[PDB]
Amino acid sequence: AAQTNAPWGLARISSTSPGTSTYYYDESAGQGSCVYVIDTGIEASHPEFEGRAQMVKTYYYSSRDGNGHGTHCAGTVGSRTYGVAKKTQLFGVKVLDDNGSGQYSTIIAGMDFVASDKNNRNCPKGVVASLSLGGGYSSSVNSAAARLQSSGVMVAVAAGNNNADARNYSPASEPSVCTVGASDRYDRRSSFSNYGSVLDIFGPGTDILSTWIGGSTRSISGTSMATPHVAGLAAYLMTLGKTTAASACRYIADTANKGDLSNIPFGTVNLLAYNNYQA
């Protein structure tokens, strides 16, 4: 399949070279896989989700996304126009308030929810969890991410936006899960992207158009925007049978474009997510 005049990051993940604007992907499109988005919520009514997104859990007085951050990230995973895996199911876990803040105890509660809840859903091909959030180091946050991964979920995590070593952030610093850095349209590391040996993979993160609240769309930048590209790519690859939850981060790194990026510090991998599609 080919989606013409695609947002740049979708084009980037199906290309060996920068400078193209056509997303190429297998029509299976992540069907039968599921992705949880642990964030500020998802506007499930948005036209672009086509009835494939729902809110399953909140920890606040409402399950609606009043911020927008969660809906944008959900759109890069699974919206018809802006998403990687256009036919995936999208579950929303509201762990952050409408200001984008959340206590670590609530975040952990949402992670353990995913590990259990997945057993109550129909996701025969695969289960991913996108975690576009982070904060100060904590072994307990890292352990919850480890537990989720250990249950049979692929957990993608944003490295953080401090131009800093990601070892000091959580759950970015948990080795067993997939830690995602941000790149720009000219194959540079984004100038805000955390780096370091704990990073697994880079994905598009600067100027990423996706869905917002009110049925709208906008562009924003962050490692939070790279992470849903990788979460959607894993779902897509599990639907194709190429990899499993426990092996998808490694599969992605092995199949990635290698040595494309610039602004990579010594000690950080030079690996850009690639879907390997050959029409």
Partner: peptide, 6 residues
């Protein structure tokens, strides 16, 4: 402690 969107 408090986490935030990235």
């Amino acid at each position: 402690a408090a986490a935030s969107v990235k």
